[PDB]
Design a protein around this ligand. Structure first.
Ligand SMILES: *[C@@H]1O[C@H](CO)[C@@H](O[C@@H]2O[C@H](CO)[C@@H](O[C@@H]3O[C@H](CO[C@H]4O[C@H](CO)[C@@H](O)[C@H](O)[C@@H]4O)[C@@H](O)[C@H](O[C@H]4O[C@H](CO)[C@@H](O)[C@H](O)[C@@H]4O)[C@@H]3O)[C@H](O)[C@H]2NC(C)=O)[C@H](O)[C@H]1NC(C)=O
Ligand SMILES: *[C@@H]1O[C@H](CO)[C@@H](O[C@@H]2O[C@H](CO)[C@@H](O[C@@H]3O[C@H](CO[C@H]4O[C@H](CO)[C@@H](O)[C@H](O)[C@@H]4O)[C@@H](O)[C@H](O[C@H]4O[C@H](CO)[C@@H](O)[C@H](O)[C@@H]4O)[C@@H]3O)[C@H](O)[C@H]2NC(C)=O)[C@H](O)[C@H]1NC(C)=O
Ligand SMILES: *[C@@H]1O[C@H](CO)[C@@H](O[C@@H]2O[C@H](CO)[C@@H](O[C@@H]3O[C@H](CO[C@H]4O[C@H](CO)[C@@H](O)[C@H](O)[C@@H]4O)[C@@H](O)[C@H](O[C@H]4O[C@H](CO)[C@@H](O)[C@H](O)[C@@H]4O)[C@@H]3O)[C@H](O)[C@H]2NC(C)=O)[C@H](O)[C@H]1NC(C)=O
Ligand SMILES: *[C@@H]1O[C@H](CO)[C@@H](O[C@@H]2O[C@H](CO)[C@@H](O[C@@H]3O[C@H](CO)[C@@H](O)[C@H](O)[C@@H]3O)[C@H](O)[C@H]2NC(C)=O)[C@H](O)[C@H]1NC(C)=O
Ligand SMILES: *[C@@H]1O[C@H](CO)[C@@H](O[C@@H]2O[C@H](CO)[C@@H](O[C@@H]3O[C@H](CO)[C@@H](O)[C@H](O)[C@@H]3O)[C@H](O)[C@H]2NC(C)=O)[C@H](O)[C@H]1NC(C)=O
Ligand SMILES: *[C@@H]1O[C@H](CO)[C@@H](O[C@@H]2O[C@H](CO)[C@@H](O)[C@H](O)[C@H]2NC(C)=O)[C@H](O)[C@H]1NC(C)=O
Ligand SMILES: *[C@@H]1O[C@H](CO)[C@@H](O[C@@H]2O[C@H](CO)[C@@H](O)[C@H](O)[C@H]2NC(C)=O)[C@H](O)[C@H]1NC(C)=O
Ligand SMILES: CC(=O)N[C@@H]1[C@@H](O)[C@@H](O)[C@@H](CO)O[C@@H]1O
Ligand SMILES: CC(=O)N[C@@H]1[C@@H](O)[C@@H](O)[C@@H](CO)O[C@@H]1O
Ligand SMILES: *[C@@H]1O[C@H](CO)[C@@H](O)[C@H](O)[C@H]1NC(C)=O
Ligand SMILES: *[C@@H]1O[C@H](CO)[C@@H](O)[C@H](O)[C@H]1NC(C)=O
Ligand SMILES: *[C@H]1O[C@H](CO)[C@H](O)[C@H](O)[C@H]1NC(C)=O
Ligand SMILES: *[C@H]1O[C@H](CO)[C@H](O)[C@H](O)[C@H]1NC(C)=O
Ligand SMILES: *[C@H]1O[C@H](CO)[C@H](O)[C@H](O)[C@H]1NC(C)=O
Ligand SMILES: [Ca+2]
Ligand SMILES: [Ca+2]
Ligand SMILES: [Ca+2]
Ligand SMILES: [Ca+2]
Ligand SMILES: [Ca+2]
Ligand SMILES: [Ca+2]
Ligand SMILES: [Ca+2]
Ligand SMILES: [Ca+2]
Ligand SMILES: [Ca+2]
Ligand SMILES: [Ca+2]
Ligand SMILES: [Ca+2]
Ligand SMILES: [Ca+2]
Ligand SMILES: [Ca+2]
Ligand SMILES: [Ca+2]
Ligand SMILES: [Ca+2]
Ligand SMILES: [Ca+2]
Ligand SMILES: [Ca+2]
Ligand SMILES: [Ca+2]
Ligand SMILES: [Ca+2]
Ligand SMILES: [Ca+2]
Lengths: 5, 1077, 361
């Protein structure tokens, strides 16, 4: 999403 | 011995005024020894030397509202008294068992009566809540094609669908509908129900979920009666032009109920603990500073200013009755202002933080900015060790954990196996252990600093309630002083968890007003837990028990990921702005952006001796007596022996025994020190410390590192072992003795044939084990969903977040019971969730305005121009969507209209990147590596003069390959130069065993590759016709050409001459032999 | 009369300025950029032209050489090309050939360098490789021992230096747009000329860089220049036309040809353009390369190699043998060419003509 590295 | 930097000896007291040390016998001796009398603190005690409306009759039931009704209808399932007084368990309805032969439809619930008369049983009307009275003893219905046929068996017309009413019993009518929104005057509830506006705020839960009774829209703030309004005791306030005017303005002269005003002139009456003050009709009490008016309005209590307001002291705080005093932790001196503490040791701090490709060493003011290491894959985690001056990190690209000294020497890799997704790590400087979270195995690990003795200490879920579980672990901090491990979770049920360092006492710390807790850390001076949220954009801190939360930044942060505190300053890393920046740790004042990082700065730490405070090791010497891990017990005082993961802990009479439980597919070392995979045995590299992994009778290794070698010179990946497929040509991968105890990783489930598949795949209506074991009906009926997961009637398992989300997930609709899916227990959280207008599901706030229909009815995407993007780290696209600023000009369309990439200037590459012809950046590792990466092949341009990195073997053609790929029996350069100069690998002159064909240039291949059209080895001796004349050039598999060379398989008549005389592209062999015999 | 040479993206066309008609030349090629020629080095009657190729996709560019007839006309001759083996070329926007010393000069716009090698392109070496944004076409003046180059990046400049890479200097840097082509008037005191695709002018200046003059204005986006006799040649890139004007800029803009926009350069093929009478100053003492300089010469080593310690002539690197050249079809006066089993270019004379290559008859 928007947090996964 | 030493005096530790800035600190004092163990038996010495530190003068908080200036940091000088005095003997312990001098403190609390009755004489001020320090410059500011810190040795004579208050904490040391001195020396010791018509009757009624509801009277009714004996045959009539009595009602609260004043009605009288016949006693026959009491507790019949419906209100007869007119006020429910005959329909409650408050007086009596618990035993409302009805009359005689009535059918008891137990599916009915208090909104309806379970007992139904047989007068209308099977009458065609849905008497029961799911109409079971129409099937239990009833003649079948033929139904009609013009009517809606319920899948359960009932028959109704199409007027009974999409109306919030269970006409079919099985909700088949209401299931799958797409209810249009409510009307103009109609009110809408959270669960999508439509109710008349008049029915708001009437003490009846008409919305079902209580939407129409919400406090915000129902409570009427009483007229405040502000300045120029005298609030009289009656509540009908007037103007103060009328105070004590002797005219009754407020009912019984409440405005003149008292005009003496000075009611404080007494002791027993008005009793105020401290001071009193009069008012226009009466008195009120007040307290001295540092005291709180409690709920009785008639006393004063001392507040704990250290717990209520920690920002009043820079460090450890001490409460006093009526006030507080700010102390400083050891190693800090108290400033003359009386509040700020200042670090004493001359070792000044600096910030160690990690980037993509980089680890950087930054001074705390932004003046100095250096490079520790470069060329790493992706450093997402990092930590240091004060005792050995070491440094640890996680390279997520390679899935390994490295370590090196702080002076760039002795780079080593401690853990390199079974690392699937490690998101964070922390170093335990006390008991010399290493901790790291796994986001794929969903667990917590502990290990020795050198890498041996890995063990699990947390898994599954935390609370006894199985609501918060290990969905997405991220961020970890240790508090070894009290033996606790704090980690943050950013799953759908996000929280912050705590567990003892030996796995005892796992509990939940913080689980409210939190969505994306990326960062976490503890301040070791005042003992305050710190964390930040990536979605809500705050920085919050609280006591170690999760109490007395306070907010530093309130919604002003784009995206924190890591943070650390030293002294009074907090440093955090922002993804969206790609910056490292700092501010005050209590209120956020003094915000300064320290550095423009091109890549995302992931993890940050402050390297200073005080950030890892010293104290005595519970496992002091002899490793606590345990042959294995000596862990700190919960509370920090005791210790607990424990065995590694692949061991069985068995308790003797008074001490612990560890038994090896190495599985059949694994090799146990000779000293029983550890259990390693069987393909690590005889691989040529010594893994066991005793060398037992490499016996004397080792067969020749045909296969690479990390590859399983079959019993006869054939290779396969380790995943092939016991997967119920014949992978080895010999079949040794499916051997019985090898597989008979093939216990595999925890997060997957094992089938009957001992092949194992991911745990969720069982009972998903797909035969995955190839023996139908995972689809066995009895097993699915009898199994259990893992903790934190709901169990379907189908036997499938789904995450708890899929329950009551409208969309079916269990095949059968037990995961969406609308009777339960609309109650008040499933209201959305008003902070982090957005309620759909029509459907009853709740979706996270960040899913709103993303270009995707998460609510299934475009509620989240409608009216997107009303959403204002974040002011600091967001960019607004043409279609008015908000995207992180880090995705602008990144190279990909990220909002569906190319707006993020319109008018884009190329960026300048960093210190470890090479710039292609078209000005894009690729790592320096990709230059001269025998593959195209710049599109225009620019990475391989002019690869003769450039060196290769010290671990790379340069090919004579100028390209580079890792030095481990030389002298191995196969060509890794594109001209076999890696093997060309290699020495003879056998005393008898050859280069590889007798089971392999050997080409001219010392590279060699398998037998079956000879004469296949594939130039297996360069300068190929495989395509030598003279030696290949006698190989089996057989018609069923090889086309024997006229020139006596044979052609492998499908290459015949393929369109290109693979033979060399033109008859490969010819007739009479690839044409019809006898016209399809 | 001089013969014009015009390279298109796929083919090379030569046009006689007096006969006013085209003739057949090299075909079946792709992404060629610029050409230059050497006048019959072996004095048999065939000159050598050098043309580069740009690259697309995975494959890289290269430099190739081919033969051209020096007589009136030649057709049906199977012209064969040969690659110099110069690997790793991105965009050779500029190429020049030095007839004194058998050296070839070219610059890579993407690599931001200027290379040097022998006519067969073996002894590769970087001459200047620092402070270039987008190096444009180049020019060489062996008589004065000075080479010229320009830049068209963020800082448009025109520079000159010795042929061995030292004594680099900038001619002008003011009132410059997008330089595209360079030319030197070998007879008018070695005056130099250059174009501009933004200012749309052609200017001239002396070799040292004094008395800058605006010769002609509003040239409709010129690309390349060539000076012969007393006239100047340029090509409008966006339209493909060729024009003439007095080299002193006091005459009307005459029209010559209209060609497709694939036209890349205009080059005059004549011996008097280069004055082959210049002698070689080299003493044949150098080991690998003998570069030129004003009043003398110098020795050089291949790229990534240095001289033996103590010495300044002998290089440490080995020396590879030269590359042989295929024979051309010398068939003259409307003859035809044919290849036998030996693959020698055995000509087929026309009616009334005799001899080996059918010279006269
Ligand atoms: C980069 O920085 C690292 C770490 O700071 C340096 O590595 C250290 O190098 C020093 C030597 O310069 C090492 O010191 C030697 O360690 C030996 C082993 O000590 C271990 O065990 C003891 C006891 O349990 C622990 O206290 C200690 O922490 C270690 O775990 C000692 O036995 C050696 O002592 C011997 O020699 C000395 C004289 O030098 C005698 O006085 C003694 O009697 C004895 O004969 C010695 O002290 C040190 O171990 C290394 N670091 C660590 C902690 O491992 C790098 O050298 C440095 N690199 C550069 C290039 O600067
Ligand atoms: C990976 O696994 C494959 C499995 O096929 C191995 O391939 C086999 O390799 C061996 C040689 O190491 C071959 O053995 C030869 O078999 C010939 C007859 O083949 C029949 O019998 C074998 C089993 O023995 C069957 O597999 C096959 O289908 C046939 O039914 C013999 O005639 C050969 O002996 C002759 O040559 C030898 C020297 O090689 C002489 O010493 C003898 O006197 C005699 O003249 C030989 O025994 C076997 O056939 C191969 N299998 C197949 C089907 O091709 C690979 O070896 C292994 N990986 C690697 C690269 O080692
Ligand atoms: C130069 O030297 C190398 C050795 O350094 C020679 O290569 C050897 O060649 C022989 C004969 O082909 C090989 O012997 C055969 O090996 C087969 C499989 O390997 C066995 O041995 C290894 C250990 O090397 C074990 O780890 C493995 O598990 C296997 O057990 C066997 O199947 C063959 O068995 C047959 O003969 C034996 C007696 O030798 C009988 O007991 C059996 O019943 C059966 O009939 C055989 O043992 C040997 O493995 C090769 N060694 C290596 C390492 O290459 C080269 O041949 C020589 N140069 C040349 C080209 O001639
Ligand atoms: C609010 O509360 C405090 C405490 O009730 C009141 O303080 C009172 O202050 C006066 C002046 O400081 C004190 O009187 C003085 O006492 C000393 C002896 O301690 C004496 O030597 C002086 O001559 C003088 O009398 C008084 O003791 C103190 N109250 C008590 C009971 O201790 C204050 O007046 C209150 N103020 C308000 C806003 O109501
Ligand atoms: C990150 O950057 C900082 C500052 O650039 C580095 O701090 C410096 O570390 C070196 C090595 O310890 C110190 O050098 C030593 O100084 C003493 C005198 O103080 C001298 O006697 C020694 O011979 C040696 O030269 C330097 O003083 C120190 N500076 C400060 C202000 O701390 C830090 O090491 C860097 N971190 C890493 C891991 O690169
Ligand atoms: C764990 O779940 C249980 C069951 O839902 C919770 O206990 C009930 O919570 C509801 C909330 O409305 C109350 O109505 C019930 O009275 C509670 N008690 C029981 C035994 O049913 C429990 O609160 C949850 N765990 C925690 C710690 O909150
Ligand atoms: C084990 O866990 C429990 C719960 O986390 C701890 O109990 C808390 O202890 C503190 C004092 O240290 C109390 O103030 C809290 O009210 C307690 N909370 C609850 C709900 O029990 C307990 O201290 C832990 N003990 C150890 C040894 O770790
Ligand atoms: C000057 C000196 O050697 N001081 C030392 C310090 O360097 C460190 O070894 C410390 C450990 O307790 O002991 C003392
Ligand atoms: C010996 C030497 O300087 N080798 C260098 C090496 O250190 C590195 O710079 C490499 C890639 O640029 O090229 C070369
Ligand atoms: C960081 O970026 C801004 C522009 O985005 C730039 O002006 C600033 O100089 C950079 N940081 C600092 C403080 O130098
Ligand atoms: C809405 O969020 C606030 C945040 O303080 C919370 O206090 C309040 O209880 C929430 N409303 C409801 C109905 O829960
Ligand atoms: C110490 O002396 C004080 C004097 O005020 C008290 O009497 C106190 O109770 C004494 N403590 C003990 C233990 O006797
Ligand atoms: C199912 O639940 C049982 C207890 O009812 C066990 O905990 C078992 O381990 C569970 N299975 C899975 C897959 O977690
Ligand atoms: C290979 O042959 C050389 C001689 O050519 C040496 O004998 C060498 O020792 C041989 N290789 C091995 C491993 O013994
Ligand atoms: Ca004292
Ligand atoms: Ca009733
Ligand atoms: Ca009925
Ligand atoms: Ca319905
Ligand atoms: Ca209501
Ligand atoms: Ca009044
Ligand atoms: Ca207090
Ligand atoms: Ca997970
Ligand atoms: Ca959430
Ligand atoms: Ca955010
Ligand atoms: Ca091993
Ligand atoms: Ca298998
Ligand atoms: Ca399945
Ligand atoms: Ca669902
Ligand atoms: Ca959405
Ligand atoms: Ca983008
Ligand atoms: Ca590459
Ligand atoms: Ca190799
Ligand atoms: Ca082959
Ligand atoms: Ca074919």
């Amino acid at each position: 999403x928007x947090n996964x590295x | 011995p030493t005096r530790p930097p800035g600190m004092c000896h163990l038996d010495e007291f530190q003068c908080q005024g200036d940091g000088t040390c005095i003997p312990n016998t001098w403190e609390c001796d009755g004489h001020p020894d320090c410059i500011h009398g810190s040795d004579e603190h208050t904490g040391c005690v001195p020396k010791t030397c018509g009757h009624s409306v509801n009277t009714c009759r004996a045959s009539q039931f009595q009602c609260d509202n004043g009605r009288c009704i016949s006693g026959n209808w009491v507790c019949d399932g419906d209100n007869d008294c007119g006020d429910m007084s005959d329909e409650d368990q408050r007086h009596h309805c618990e035993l409302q068992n009805c009359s005689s032969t009535q059918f008891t439809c137990v599916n009915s619930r208090p909104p309806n009566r379970r007992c139904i008369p047989q007068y209308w049983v099977c009458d065609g009307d849905a008497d029961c809540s799911d109409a079971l009275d129409e099937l239990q003893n009833c003649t079948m219905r033929t139904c009609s094609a013009g009517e809606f046929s319920c899948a359960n068996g009932r028959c109704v017309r199409q007027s009974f669908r999409c109306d919030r009413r269970n006409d079919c019993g099985d909700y088949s009518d209401e299931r799958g509908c797409s209810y249009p929104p409510c009307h103009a005057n109609q009110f809408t509830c959270q669960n999508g129900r439509c109710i008349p506006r008049f029915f708001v705020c009437d003490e009846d839960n008409d919305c079902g979920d209580g939407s129409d009774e919400q406090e915000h829209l129902c409570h009427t703030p009483e007229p405040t009666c502000p300045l120029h309004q005298f609030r009289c005791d009656n509540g009908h306030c007037i103007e103060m032009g009328r105070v004590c005017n002797h005219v009754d303005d407020c009912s019984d002269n409440s405005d003149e109920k008292g005009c003496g005003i000075n009611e404080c002139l007494d002791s027993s009456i008005s009793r105020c603990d401290h001071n009193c003050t009069d008012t226009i009709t009466s008195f009120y009490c007040s307290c001295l500073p540092g005291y709180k008016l409690m709920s009785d309005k008639r006393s004063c209590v001392d507040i704990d200013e250290c717990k209520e307001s920690p920002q009043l002291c820079s460090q450890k705080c001490e409460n006093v009755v009526g006030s507080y005093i700010c102390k400083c932790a050891p190693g800090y001196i108290r400033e003359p202002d009386g509040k700020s503490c200042r670090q004493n040791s001359n070792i000044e701090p600096y910030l160690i933080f990690s980037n993509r490709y980089y680890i950087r060493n930054l001074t705390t003011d932004g003046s100095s900015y250096s490079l520790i290491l470069q060329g790493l894959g992706n450093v997402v985690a990092l930590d240091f060790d004060r005792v050995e001056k070491r440094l640890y990190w996680i390279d997520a690209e390679k899935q390994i954990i490295e370590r090196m000294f702080l002076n760039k020497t002795n780079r080593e890799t401690i853990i390199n196996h079974r690392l699937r997704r490690a998101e964070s790590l922390a170093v335990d400087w006390v008991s010399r252990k290493l901790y790291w979270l796994d986001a794929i195995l969903d667990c917590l690990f502990v290990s020795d600093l050198e890498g041996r003795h890995r063990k699990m200490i947390a898994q599954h879920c935390v609370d006894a309630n199985n609501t918060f579980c290990f969905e997405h672990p991220r961020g970890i901090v240790l508090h070894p002083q009290r033996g606790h491990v704090y980690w943050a979770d950013w799953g759908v049920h996000a929280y912050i968890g705590r567990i003892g360092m030996d796995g005892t006492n796992k509990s939940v710390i913080i689980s409210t007003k939190i969505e994306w807790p990326n960062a976490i850390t503890i301040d070791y001076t005042n003992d305050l837990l710190y964390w930040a949220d990536a979605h809500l954009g705050y920085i919050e801190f609280s006591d170690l028990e999760g109490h007395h939360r306070h907010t530093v930044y309130d919604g002003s942060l784009p995206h924190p990921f890591a943070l650390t505190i030293f002294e009074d300053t907090v440093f955090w890393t922002d993804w969206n702005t790609r910056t490292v920046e700092k501010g005050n740790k209590y209120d956020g004042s003094g915000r300064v952006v320290l550095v423009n990082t091109t890549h995302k700065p992931f993890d940050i730490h402050v390297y200073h001796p005080y950030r890892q405070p010293i104290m005595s090791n519970p496992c002091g010497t002899n490793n606590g007596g345990c042959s294995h891990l000596c862990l700190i017990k919960a509370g920090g005082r005791g210790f607990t022996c424990a065995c590694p993961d692949d061991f069985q802990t068995v308790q003797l009479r008074d001490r612990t025994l560890c038994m090896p439980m190495c599985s059949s597919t694994q090799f146990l070392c000779g000293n029983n020190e550890k259990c390693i995979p069987i393909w690590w045995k005889c691989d040529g590299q010594k893994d066991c410390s005793d060398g037992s992994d490499e016996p004397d009778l080792c067969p020749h290794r045909f296969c690479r590192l990390g590859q399983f070698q079959c019993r006869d010179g054939n290779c396969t990946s380790p995943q092939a072992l016991c997967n119920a497929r014949q992978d080895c040509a010999d079949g040794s991968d499916e051997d019985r003795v090898l597989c008979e105890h093939h216990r595999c990783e925890s997060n997957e489930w094992q089938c009957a044939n001992k092949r194992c598949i991911p745990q969720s795949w069982q009972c998903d209506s797909v035969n995955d084990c190839l023996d139908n074991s995972d689809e066995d009906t009895s097993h699915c009926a009898s199994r259990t969903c893992r903790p934190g997961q709901f169990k379907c009637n189908n036997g499938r398992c789904i995450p708890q977040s899929w329950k009551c989300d409208v969309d079916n997930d269990c095949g059968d609709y037990s995961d969406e019971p609308i009777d339960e899916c609309t109650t008040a227990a499933y209201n959305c959280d008003n902070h982090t969730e957005f309620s759909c207008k029509t459907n009853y599901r709740c979706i996270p706030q960040w899913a709103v305005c993303n270009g995707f229909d998460d609510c299934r009815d475009n509620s989240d995407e409608q009216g997107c121009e009303s959403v204002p993007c974040h002011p600091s780290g967001d960019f607004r696209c043409a279609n008015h969507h908000c995207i992180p600023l880090r995705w602008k000009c990144d190279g990909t369309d990220d909002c569906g209209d190319n707006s993020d990439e319109e008018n884009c200037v190329p960026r300048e590459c960093s210190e470890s990147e090479f710039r292609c012809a078209d000005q894009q950046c690729i790592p320096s590792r990709w230059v001269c590596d025998q593959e195209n990466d710049c599109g225009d092949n620019s990475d391989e341009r002019d690869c003769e003069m450039k060196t290769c990195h010290p671990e790379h073997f340069q090919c004579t053609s100028g390209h580079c390959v890792p030095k481990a790929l030389a002298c191995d029996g196969r060509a890794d350069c594109l001209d076999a130069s890696d093997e060309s100069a290699c020495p003879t690998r056998f005393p008898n002159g050859t280069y590889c065993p007798a089971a392999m064909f050997e080409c001219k240039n010392h590279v060699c291949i398998q037998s079956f590759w000879i004469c296949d059209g594939e130039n297996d080895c360069v300068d190929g001796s495989d395509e030598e016709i003279h030696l290949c004349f006698n190989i089996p050039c057989e018609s069923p598999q090889r086309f024997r050409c006229d020139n006596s060379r044979c052609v492998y398989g499908h290459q015949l008549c393929n369109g290109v001459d693979d033979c060399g005389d033109g008859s490969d592209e010819k007739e009479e062999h690839c044409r019809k032999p006898t016209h399809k015999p």
